[PDB]
Amino acid sequence: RVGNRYRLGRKIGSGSFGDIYLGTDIAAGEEVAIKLECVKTKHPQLHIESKIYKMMQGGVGIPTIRWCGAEGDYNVMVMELLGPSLEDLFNFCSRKFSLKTVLLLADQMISRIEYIHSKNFIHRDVKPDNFLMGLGKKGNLVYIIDFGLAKKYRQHIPYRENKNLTGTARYASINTHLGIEQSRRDDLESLGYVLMYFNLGSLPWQGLKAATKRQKYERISEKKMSTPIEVLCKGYPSEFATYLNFCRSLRFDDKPDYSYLRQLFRNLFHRQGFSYDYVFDWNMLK
Numbered sequence: 001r002v003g004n005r006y007r008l009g010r011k012i013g014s015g016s017f018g019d020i021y022l023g024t025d026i027a028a029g030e031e032v033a034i035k036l037e038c039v040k041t042k043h044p045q046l047h048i049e050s051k052i053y054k055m056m057q058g059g060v061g062i063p064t065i066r067w068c069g070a071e072g073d074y075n076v077m078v079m080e081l082l083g084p085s086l087e088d089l090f091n092f093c094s095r096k097f098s099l100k101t102v103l104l105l106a107d108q109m110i111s112r113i114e115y116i117h118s119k120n121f122i123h124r125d126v127k128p129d130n131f132l133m134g135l136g137k138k139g140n141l142v143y144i145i146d147f148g149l150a151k152k153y154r155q156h157i158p159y160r161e162n163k164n165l166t167g168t169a170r171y172a173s174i175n176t177h178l179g180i181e182q183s184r185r186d187d188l189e190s191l192g193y194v195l196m197y198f199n200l201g202s203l204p205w206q207g208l209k210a211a212t213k214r215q216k217y218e219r220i221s222e223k224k225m226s227t228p229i230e231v232l233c234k235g236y237p238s239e240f241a242t243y244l245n246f247c248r249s250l251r252f253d254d255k256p257d258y259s260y261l262r263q264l265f266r267n268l269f270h271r272q273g274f275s276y277d278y279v280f281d282w283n284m285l286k
């Protein structure tokens with residue numbers, strides 16, 4: 001009923017500019033994730049996003065793209081099925097992750113973003129929902145998904161201001177709130193807020209009161225810019241504050257020192273005496 005060998009199932013979620021459905025590859029006897037886009041939509045993107053996935057193929061933690069085409073009223077992208085998102089797993093774990101789990105995640109997540117940047121793209125929506133654990137033998141592997149908002153940043157793109165927020169406000173960089181064109185530094189700053197989100201259970205600019213929706217962004221921006229990093233990270237290892245400070249110090253077109261940032265957390269990991277066995281909090285449920 002789709003691509004001759006795929007059967008469409010129930011709806012399991014939504015991404016940028018489309019919904020994700022469960023499917024079965026009948027010939028291979030394997031489940032897949034299927035993203036649908038109305039063929040007649042005013043701004044078609046799916047075939048663009050699929051070209052990005054096809055170009056990222058072979059990178060660690062990039063989902064495999066099995067088929068792309070058009071059936072009936074829909075453009076179709078068939079992907080390997082992945083496991084739960086870090087947001088789902090965070091909620092399943094009662095919104096508290098151990099330091100070991102945060103550091104295991106940080107190590108992989110920095111690498112995913114570096115890989116995307118190595119392919120001349122910035123993700124621009126770094127958030128727990130867009131990182132998924134693999135299934136089965138890949139269950140220790142963090143995947144990144146959803147390139148619907150991705151953009152090619154290179155010869156670097158020029159410095160531009162006054163550009164509406166393209167991403168989630170909660171994890172957006174301060175530069176993004178100021179209207180500055182996003183670049184590599186902003187993906188990493190967003191990751192920094194995600195890590196503090198995992199440590200705290202919430203960020204201090206969550207749950208602010210506002211009506212007309214522009215007011216909400218104003219208030220998030222204000223709180224984010226008036227919350228010093230040392231206050232945000234108080235009571236947690238200094239490496240997280242150093243990480244955020246480093247990202248906030250990056251120039252627009254700087255190539256981030258990914259190795260330095262990973263080594264920050266690796267050194268903390270070793271000082272804690274943790275083992276790199278990939279045993280996350282959720283793997284210890286009986």
Ligand SMILES: Cc1ccc2nc(NC(=O)CSc3nc4c(c(=O)n3-c3ccccc3)SCC4)sc2c1
Binds near residue numbers: 012079
């Ligand atoms: C672009 C892309 C690529 C891969 C991919 N993999 C995904 N995996 C999941 O979302 C988790 S599996 C799952 N999620 C949900 C329900 C669900 O029933 N499943 C599921 C699917 C198959 C077998 C068992 C459970 S109910 C609503 C949320 S998103 C996704 C999106």
